[PDB]
């Protein structure tokens, strides 16, 4: 979908959400690999370390409203009035579904304070999120988004309830297994966003009140027991960062109205004030947490391998075993190393004999190929990979065989000139 600009005196492609995880009507789960590759394997982002921002929680609790303002920020980080004009209707940016995961088609490229340009990915994860519902659709889409995310924004209404915390059991024992095998915490940031907070006199709006409130909800106490003692004891060994932000109610007009579409000044003022703090608190350059596993920052190319590894175990009749989750993580970590190594081979061959570049003598083509293949083998060998050397051996063999396939296609192409 293109659209006219005249700001650029030109047509421009229209960014929008893209369905990547799909819960079908028979309750089967499909990953749209094609759609995912189109977004994450493009030349501008493929090699960039990725920040995967997920917003997840129950239907109809303001996830798409909040992501509208996330888009406002990401598109106007330079301006200090990124939020828009108050006597203006909320123009410009809109997300809006069924159970699944959508991603914003445009990957944002941001400079971290130290100067590294990273890629920011935005995800919206929806389901019923009712723990008494007897079907696993919402749990699996929530587990998957969390496994993919480096910032998971858990969007809740009014409180953190025991049943909200029970969903974190999906990653409890995995996080310990992962912990014990990599000697590092498996996840980066978890954020409890409490909407419609009504008790600012007890815990103030925003991050500081949020911290104290969460600390008191997360107390272990034998009145919970029932493995919510457990989840509370283990959540910190899963996540590098855990925090909580309390947000006022937006006012009647916003609540009672699907797509309220009015002047920003009609929204409740305290809510707008805290929303303007929330978004940069989540998404500013210093705040962006790069996806990371086994001490390796993950790229847009690499992240695709985590998508593919996880869908394998989240499909089927039931949720996966915790050891299967860890197996899937180790498999993606090795395949990400394969993709990186294969990529640098591919780019360097492309420079030597792709395009209209002149014919190459076959012996010289071969000698250049062997040198580049061996460089990528050493590159792959040097990556700190999960699973141990026997586990990784089969992935080295896959890299060698995929590089060979590339070389054959270059021979074929070089034979046409
Ligand atoms: N009570 C309440 N309603 C909200 C909030 N933010 C947005 N809404 C409204 O709730 C309705 C559904 O919101 P939506 O973003 O589509 O929810 P989603 O299904 O989680 O994405 C819309 O009319 C919004 O205007 C909030 O913080 N609190
Ligand atoms: Mg939504």
Swiss-Prot record:
Binding residue positions for Mg(2+): 64
Coiled-coil residue spans: 390-417
Membrane-protein topology: Multi-pass membrane protein
Modified residues (Phosphoserine): 5-6
Expression sites (tissue/organ): Expressed predominantly in the adult and fetal central nervous system. Measurable expression in all tissues examined, although expression in adult brain is at least 50-fold higher than in other tissues. Detected predominantly in pyramidal neurons in the cerebral cortex and the hippocampus of the brain. Expressed in upper and lower motor neurons (at protein level).
Predominant location category: endoplasmic reticulum
Known outcome of mutating residue 333 to K: In HSN1D; the mutant protein has decreased GTPase activity compared to wild-type and causes disruption of endoplasmic reticulum network morphology
GO cellular component: axon; endoplasmic reticulum; endoplasmic reticulum membrane; endoplasmic reticulum tubular network; endoplasmic reticulum tubular network membrane; Golgi apparatus; Golgi cis cisterna membrane; Golgi membrane
GO biological processes: axonogenesis; endoplasmic reticulum membrane fusion; endoplasmic reticulum organization; endoplasmic reticulum tubular network membrane organization; protein homooligomerization
Post-translational modification as stated in the protein's UniProt record: Phosphorylated. Phosphorylation, by different kinases, of the N-terminal hypervariable region (HVR) regulates the ATL1-mediated membrane tethering step.
Compartmental location: Endoplasmic reticulum membrane; Golgi apparatus membrane; Cell projection, Axon
A GO molecular-function descriptor: GTPase-dependent fusogenic activity
Catalytic activity of the protein: GTP + H2O = GDP + phosphate + H(+)
Impact upon substituting residue 5 to E: No effect on GTPase-dependent fusogenic activity. No effect on the membrane tethering step
Function of the molecule: Atlastin-1 (ATL1) is a membrane-anchored GTPase that mediates the GTP-dependent fusion of endoplasmic reticulum (ER) membranes, maintaining the continuous ER network. It facilitates the formation of three-way junctions where ER tubules intersect. Two atlastin-1 on neighboring ER tubules bind GTP and form loose homodimers through the GB1/RHD3-type G domains and 3HB regions. Upon GTP hydrolysis, the 3HB regions tighten, pulling the membranes together to drive their fusion. After fusion, the homodimer disassembles upon release of inorganic phosphate (Pi).
Quaternary context: Monomeric and homodimeric. The homodimer, transiently formed by two molecules on opposing membranes, is the active form mediating ER membrane fusion. Interacts with REEP1, REEP5, RTN3 and RTN4 (via the transmembrane region); these proteins are involved in endoplasmic reticulum tubular network organization. Interacts with ZFYVE27; both proteins are involved in endoplasmic reticulum tubular network organization. Interacts with ARL6IP1; both proteins are involved in endoplasmic reticulum tubular network organization.
Domain observations: The N-terminal hypervariable region (HVR) regulates ATL1-mediated membrane tethering by organizing ATL1 into a lattice structure on the same membrane. It does not affect GTP hydrolysis or membrane fusion. It has no effect on the GTP hydrolysis and fusion steps. The GB1/RHD3-type G domain mediates GTP-binding and hydrolysis as well as homodimerization.
Record's protein name: Atlastin-1
Organism: Homo sapiens (Human)
Residues of the full protein shown: 18 to 439 of 558
């Amino acid at each position: 979908t293109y659209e006219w600009s005249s700001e650029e005196e030109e047509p421009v492609k229209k960014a929008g959400p893209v369905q990547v995880l799909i819960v079908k009507d028979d309750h089967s789960f499909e990953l749209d690999e094609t759609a995912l590759n189109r977004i994450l394997l493009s030349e501008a982002v493929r090699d960039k370390e990725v920040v995967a921002v997920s917003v997840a929680g129950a239907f109809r609790k303001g996830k798409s409203f909040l992501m509208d303002f996330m888009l406002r920020y990401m598109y106007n980080q330079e301006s200090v009035d990124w939020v828009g004009d108050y006597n203006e209707p909320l123009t410009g940016f809109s997300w809006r579904e069924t159970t699944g995961i959508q991603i914003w088609s445009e990957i944002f490229l941001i400079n971290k304070p130290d100067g590294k340009k990273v890629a920011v990915l935005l995800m919206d994860t929806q389901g019923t999120f009712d723990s008494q519902s007897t079907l696993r659709d919402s749990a699996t889409v929530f587990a998957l988004s969390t496994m993919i995310s480096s910032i998971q924004v858990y969007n809740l209404s009014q409180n953190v309830q025991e049943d909200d915390l029970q969903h974190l059991q999906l990653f409890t024992e995995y996080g310990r297994l992962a912990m014990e095998e990599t000697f590092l915490k498996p996840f980066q940031s978890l954020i409890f966003l409490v909407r419609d907070w009504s008790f600012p006199y007890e815990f103030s709006y925003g991050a500081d009140g949020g911290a104290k409130f969460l600390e008191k909800r997360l107390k272990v106490s034998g009145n919970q027991h029932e493995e919510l003692q457990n989840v509370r004891k283990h959540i910190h060994s899963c996540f590098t960062n855990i925090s909580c932000f309390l947000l006022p109610h937006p006012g009647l007009k916003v609540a009672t109205n699907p797509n309220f579409d009015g002047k920003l000044k009609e929204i409740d003022d305290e809510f707008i004030k805290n929303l303007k703090i929330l978004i940069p608190w989540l998404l500013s350059p210093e705040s962006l947490d790069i996806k990371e596993i086994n001490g390796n920052k993950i790229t847009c190319r690499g992240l695709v391998e985590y998508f593919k590894a996880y869908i394998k175990i989240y499909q089927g009749e039931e949720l996966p075993h915790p050891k299967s989750m860890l197996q899937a993580t180790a498999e993606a970590n090795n395949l990400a190393a394969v993709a990186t190594a294969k990529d640098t081979y591919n780019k360097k061959m492309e420079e030597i004999c792709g395009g209209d570049k002149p014919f190459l003598a076959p012996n010289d083509l071969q000698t250049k190929h062997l040198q580049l293949k061996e460089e990528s083998v050493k590159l792959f060998r040097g990556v700190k990979k999960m699973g141990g050397e026997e586990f990784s051996r089969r992935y080295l063999q896959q890299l060698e065989s995929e590089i060979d396939e590339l070389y054959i296609q270059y021979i074929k192409h070089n034979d046409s000139k």
